[PDB]
Amino acid sequence: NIPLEELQRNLQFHAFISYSGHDSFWVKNELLPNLEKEGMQICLHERNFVPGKSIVENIITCIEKSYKSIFVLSPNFVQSEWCHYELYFAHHNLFHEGSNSLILILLEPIPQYSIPSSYHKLKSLMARRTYLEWPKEKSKRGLFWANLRAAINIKLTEQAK
């Protein structure tokens, strides 16, 4: 995968994984090992956190030090994790709509009723319909992982003009 060294900037991780503690068993047993077991460096604001910093600072710090950002979407993420971003993306611009920067993983479908109308950047991001979906068919996995590593190692888009 991407050789963090040979990269322009001095990034410390291939990706930052943002999830909800509720989805912990899957991240810890499915996502992380199928990613780390293959040489990648992931930041978890929990493991790679820093004492004496706000929650937002730890997050905004991992986004910066890692090539890509992965969001494990689910009702629990929307429920207990998305505010931080909706609030941030409000007075800041970091993840465009269509770029390569953000990877959205749809771990569990999210009913339209659990999405506070106030969550604009979330509905938007979702609108573009580009998230990877955790397959129900065990058979369709591996295809997910492939698309996932592909998503991480794909090259970032430029700044155009």
Side-chain angles (χ1 to χ4, degrees):
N1 337 288
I2 304 321
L4 266 63
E5 321 77 76
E6 310 302 359
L7 234 62
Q8 2 77 296
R9 296 295 181 177
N10 201 307
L11 304 181
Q12 288 187 53
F13 312 87
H14 299 66
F16 163 49
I17 302 178
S18 173
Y19 64 106
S20 171
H22 292 62
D23 311 311
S24 169
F25 190 84
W26 182 78
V27 174
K28 294 266 174 55
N29 293 83
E30 206 74 328
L31 223 198
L32 253 46
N34 268 61
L35 243 57
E36 301 185 75
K37 273 57 181 301
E38 211 177 3
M40 277 182 246
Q41 312 301 304
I42 297 83
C43 142
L44 282 67
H45 80 69
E46 317 82 270
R47 295 184 320 187
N48 311 87
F49 77 126
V50 182
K53 298 181 63 180
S54 75
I55 191 76
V56 191
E57 266 124 58
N58 294 298
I59 287 177
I60 186 185
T61 292
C62 267
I63 285 168
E64 288 176 353
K65 301 168 64 178
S66 42
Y67 198 50
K68 301 282 178 44
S69 267
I70 304 164
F71 284 170
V72 184
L73 269 40
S74 64
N76 292 300
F77 185 83
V78 169
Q79 204 114 285
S80 85
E81 223 59 58
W82 187 265
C83 195
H84 290 149
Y85 297 93
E86 191 60 64
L87 175 52
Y88 190 68
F89 291 154
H91 307 185
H92 299 70
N93 180 287
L94 176 46
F95 294 157
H96 300 299
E97 301 178 59
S99 63
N100 270 190
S101 200
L102 193 51
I103 312 305
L104 297 183
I105 287 175
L106 198 267
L107 183 57
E108 266 156 46
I110 312 173
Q112 250 307 310
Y113 67 68
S114 62
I115 302 174
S117 66
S118 64
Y119 291 178
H120 299 313
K121 181 92 288 85
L122 179 58
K123 300 183 175 68
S124 150
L125 278 169
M126 302 227 73
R128 75 187 188 190
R129 290 197 132 174
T130 22
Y131 57 73
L132 278 123
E133 314 201 20
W134 179 240
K136 289 111 298 177
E137 312 174 53
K138 311 183 88 287
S139 164
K140 298 309 194 190
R141 298 177 191 178
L143 169 48
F144 173 81
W145 296 126
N147 291 20
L148 184 59
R149 305 205 197 67
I152 295 176
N153 296 328
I154 207 72
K155 165 160 170 295
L156 290 170
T157 279
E158 295 68 65
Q159 302 180 300
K161 180 180 62 180

